[PDB]
Enzyme design. Structure first.
Site, PDB file in Angstrom:
ATOM      1  N   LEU A  23      81.367 -50.877   6.011  1.00 18.19           N
ATOM      2  CA  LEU A  23      80.284 -50.633   5.540  1.00 18.19           C
ATOM      3  C   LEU A  23      80.211 -51.535   4.776  1.00 18.19           C
ATOM      4  O   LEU A  23      78.596 -51.464   4.346  1.00 18.19           O
ATOM      5  CB  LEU A  23      79.924 -49.451   5.337  1.00 18.19           C
ATOM      6  CG  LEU A  23      80.867 -48.280   6.217  1.00 18.19           C
ATOM      7  CD1 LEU A  23      80.723 -46.226   5.509  1.00 18.19           C
ATOM      8  CD2 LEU A  23      80.505 -47.975   7.628  1.00 18.19           C
ATOM      9  N   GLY A  24      81.330 -51.976   4.418  1.00 19.44           N
ATOM     10  CA  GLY A  24      80.563 -53.577   3.009  1.00 19.44           C
ATOM     11  C   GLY A  24      81.910 -54.263   2.437  1.00 19.44           C
ATOM     12  O   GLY A  24      81.848 -54.993   2.070  1.00 19.44           O
ATOM     13  N   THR A  25      85.931 -53.468  -0.003  1.00 26.45           N
ATOM     14  CA  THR A  25      85.564 -53.456   0.989  1.00 26.45           C
ATOM     15  C   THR A  25      85.052 -51.560   1.168  1.00 26.45           C
ATOM     16  O   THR A  25      86.906 -50.916   1.152  1.00 26.45           O
ATOM     17  CB  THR A  25      86.485 -54.058   1.976  1.00 26.45           C
ATOM     18  OG1 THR A  25      86.481 -55.496   1.898  1.00 26.45           O
ATOM     19  CG2 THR A  25      85.937 -53.536   3.305  1.00 26.45           C
ATOM     20  N   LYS A  45      87.624 -46.509   0.527  1.00 25.59           N
ATOM     21  CA  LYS A  45      87.395 -47.602   0.006  1.00 25.59           C
ATOM     22  C   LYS A  45      88.612 -48.374  -0.387  1.00 25.59           C
ATOM     23  O   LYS A  45      90.112 -47.518  -0.944  1.00 25.59           O
ATOM     24  CB  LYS A  45      86.527 -47.188  -1.144  1.00 25.59           C
ATOM     25  CG  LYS A  45      86.066 -48.085  -2.216  1.00 25.59           C
ATOM     26  CD  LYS A  45      85.674 -47.605  -3.865  1.00 25.59           C
ATOM     27  CE  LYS A  45      84.885 -48.650  -4.556  1.00 25.59           C
ATOM     28  NZ  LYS A  45      84.576 -47.978  -5.287  1.00 25.59           N
ATOM     29  N   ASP A 132      77.020 -45.524 -15.010  1.00 24.55           N
ATOM     30  CA  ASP A 132      76.604 -45.984 -14.914  1.00 24.55           C
ATOM     31  C   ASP A 132      75.644 -45.432 -13.767  1.00 24.55           C
ATOM     32  O   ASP A 132      75.379 -45.873 -12.431  1.00 24.55           O
ATOM     33  CB  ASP A 132      77.882 -47.302 -13.598  1.00 24.55           C
ATOM     34  CG  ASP A 132      77.247 -48.131 -12.633  1.00 24.55           C
ATOM     35  OD1 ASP A 132      75.824 -48.289 -13.206  1.00 24.55           O
ATOM     36  OD2 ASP A 132      77.556 -48.079 -12.071  1.00 24.55           O
TER      37      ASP A 132
HETATM   38  F1  LIG Z   1      83.691 -44.077  -0.148  1.00 20.42           F
HETATM   39  C1  LIG Z   1      83.342 -44.761  -1.678  1.00 20.42           C
HETATM   40  C2  LIG Z   1      84.488 -44.065  -2.591  1.00 20.42           C
HETATM   41 BR1  LIG Z   1      85.961 -44.118  -1.508  1.00 20.42          BR
HETATM   42  C3  LIG Z   1      83.921 -43.800  -3.728  1.00 20.42           C
HETATM   43  C4  LIG Z   1      82.756 -44.698  -4.123  1.00 20.42           C
HETATM   44  C5  LIG Z   1      81.369 -44.735  -3.096  1.00 20.42           C
HETATM   45  C6  LIG Z   1      82.218 -44.772  -1.997  1.00 20.42           C
HETATM   46  N1  LIG Z   1      80.881 -45.413  -1.038  1.00 20.42           N
HETATM   47  C7  LIG Z   1      80.735 -44.369   0.269  1.00 20.42           C
HETATM   48  N2  LIG Z   1      81.688 -42.926  -0.160  1.00 20.42           N
HETATM   49  C8  LIG Z   1      80.845 -42.397   1.029  1.00 20.42           C
HETATM   50  N3  LIG Z   1      79.281 -42.506   1.818  1.00 20.42           N
HETATM   51  C9  LIG Z   1      79.934 -43.621   1.850  1.00 20.42           C
HETATM   52  C10 LIG Z   1      78.536 -44.489   2.708  1.00 20.42           C
HETATM   53  C11 LIG Z   1      77.609 -46.223   2.680  1.00 20.42           C
HETATM   54  C12 LIG Z   1      77.788 -46.347   1.427  1.00 20.42           C
HETATM   55  C13 LIG Z   1      79.169 -46.224   0.957  1.00 20.42           C
HETATM   56  C14 LIG Z   1      79.974 -44.591   1.367  1.00 20.42           C
HETATM   57  O1  LIG Z   1      77.654 -47.948   1.566  1.00 20.42           O
HETATM   58  C15 LIG Z   1      76.327 -47.335   1.619  1.00 20.42           C
HETATM   59  C16 LIG Z   1      75.888 -47.150   3.271  1.00 20.42           C
HETATM   60  O2  LIG Z   1      77.061 -45.637   3.240  1.00 20.42           O
END
Ligand SMILES: Fc1c(Br)cccc1Nc1ncnc2cc3c(cc12)OCCO3
Length: 283
Positions: A23-24, A25, A45, A132
């Site tokens: 999704l993005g 890591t 994450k 934040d």
């Molecule tokens: F996984 C995490 C942790 Br562990 C700590 C902090 C943030 C995150 N980010 C996310 N958390 C749950 N659903 C998500 C769904 C997403 C996303 C991030 C997500 O990025 C964009 C598109 O869809």
């Protein structure tokens, strides 16, 4: 004498969960707890210094339990340190708002404001300062249900020593002071993001200039869809005197009243699969 933080930190076997897509890591995936007949949709994450910080994030995220904050499901200590949290399928509210601007009604906008105020009031309850708060750090479980996330900067309450400058109270730009009331300032900037359907605040202005602009009395402008009632609430989040700003408990109440008659306050043109269980029902 603060209270003992008896939260549990769950350590997950990496065999318990199957990654699925980047999704993005951050990845999405599926977590099958140990011999339990459930599948949990999860985001995942993924040096020494960095580890020190992601464990800070997991410490905070394991210590919150509220319907409008993302809680940590667990960590995985493989060759890398992974945080496991509930999948928020619709993603970032900042992207969600930009993507569906021609389709978001006043009821949703005001309900989002209420839920975010609720999340922040809960963090204030836990003597917790986010530092934040921003629309990019609110996730969307369903269109009717958002949760605050990203606690990498959260501290357990002032403060000290990259920083999100255009969302910060003036006393934070100036003195690295952070309060539940500096969070209210950031809440105001976030509400402004949502009411402009994702505009960048002080767009074009370099961060160096921000502190002097706020000193000259300047503030973000009134969004088109906003009645003076809504905009004035935002303007109060930006008082120089931090104690003059509203409390989160009051933001809940003011936006709650408005959400009972949304059109009076926002003016918007045109108002594998079996055994799957959402994290909010796996307790
Ligand atoms: F996984 C995490 C942790 Br562990 C700590 C902090 C943030 C995150 N980010 C996310 N958390 C749950 N659903 C998500 C769904 C997403 C996303 C991030 C997500 O990025 C964009 C598109 O869809």
């Amino acid at each position: 004498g603060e209270a003992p933080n008896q939260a549990l930190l769950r350590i997950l076997k990496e065999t318990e969960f199957k990654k699925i897509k980047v999704l993005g890591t951050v990845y999405k995936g599926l977590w099958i707890p140990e011999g339990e007949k459930v599948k949990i949709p999860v985001a995942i994450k993924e040096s020494p210094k960095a580890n020190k910080e992601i464990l800070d994030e997991a410490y905070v995220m394991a210590s919150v339990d509220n319907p409008h904050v993302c809680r940590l499901l667990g960590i995985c200590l493989t060759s890398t340190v992974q945080l496991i949290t509930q999948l928020m399928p619709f993603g970032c509210l900042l992207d969600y708002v930009r993507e569906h601007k021609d389709n978001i009604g006043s009821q949703y906008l005001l309900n989002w404001c209420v839920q975010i105020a609720k999340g922040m009031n809960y963090l204030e309850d836990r003597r917790l300062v986010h530092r934040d708060l921003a629309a990019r750090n609110v996730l969307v479980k369903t269109p009717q249900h958002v949760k605050i996330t990203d606690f990498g900067l959260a501290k357990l309450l002032e403060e000290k020593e990259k920083v999100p400058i255009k969302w910060m109270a003036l006393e934070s730009i100036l003195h690295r002071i952070y309060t539940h009331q500096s969070d209210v300032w950031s809440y105001g900037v976030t509400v402004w993001e949502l009411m402009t359907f994702g505009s960048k605040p002080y767009d074009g202005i370099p961060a160096s200039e921000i502190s002097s602009i706020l000193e000259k009395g300047e503030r973000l402008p009134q969004p088109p869809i906003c009645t003076i009632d809504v905009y004035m609430i935002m303007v109060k989040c930006w008082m120089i005197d931090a104690d003059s700003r509203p409390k989160f408990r009051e933001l809940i109440i003011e936006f709650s009243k408005m959400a009972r008659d949304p059109q009076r306050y926002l003016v918007i043109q045109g108002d594998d699969m079996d055994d799957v269980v959402d994290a909010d029902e796996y307790l």
